[PDB]
Design a protein around this ligand. Structure first.
Ligand SMILES: Cc1cn([C@H]2C[C@H](OP(=O)([O-])OP(=O)([O-])OC[C@H]3O[C@@H](n4cnc5c(N)ncnc54)[C@H](O)[C@@H]3OP(=O)(O)O)[C@@H](COP(=O)(O)O)O2)c(=O)[nH]c1=O
Length: 124
């Protein structure tokens, strides 16, 4: 089984590297984290920070979520992340991704008790 917090960890956390490794990073990560089983997720972001630093975001700047809900929080500092975005020729089952490294503020939705991240909303 997988709790909501565990799913966020599997889908968005990669503390191992301080930044995306090779240009093949996304293709490999989207595959190993089971993010292309039923379809190709159009976009997925991986965070290269410790879990504690990401969990701490739930006690930072409260802001509105893209879906209108208000349980989203923006990080005060910028974090190291990798955006994985499909290429123009990507088509299930052969999902392919462009790897883009970046340093930006992250916005996640938190829920639960403990109040932890369960959804990655955006980067700014
Ligand atoms: C834009 C963008 C998107 N993504 C990623 C983020 C999403 O994956 P994701 O895996 O992070 O999305 P999810 O909806 O599956 O979130 C996992 C669970 O979180 C719950 N939840 C709780 N609070 C909220 C709020 N406030 N908004 C949205 N969702 C919320 C939700 O109901 C789910 O419950 P279950 O499905 O029952 O497990 C995906 C879609 O892009 P969308 O444009 O629709 O947001 O792309 C990313 O990784 N990076 C990006 O830059």
């Amino acid at each position: 089984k997988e709790t909501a917090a565990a799913k966020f960890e599997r889908q968005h956390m990669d503390s191992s590297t301080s930044a995306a490794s090779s240009s093949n990073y996304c293709n490999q990560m989207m595959k190993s984290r089971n993010l292309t089983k039923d379809r190709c997720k159009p976009v997925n972001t991986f965070v290269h920070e410790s879990l504690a630093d990401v969990q701490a975001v739930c006690s930072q700047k409260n802001v509105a979520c893209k879906n209108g809900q208000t349980n989203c929080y923006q990080s005060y500092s910028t974090m190291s992340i990798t955006d994985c975005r499909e290429t123009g020729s990507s088509k299930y089952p052969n999902c392919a991704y462009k790897t883009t490294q970046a340093n930006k503020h992250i916005i996640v939705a938190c829920e639960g008790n403990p109040y932890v991240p369960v959804h990655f909303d955006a980067s700014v």
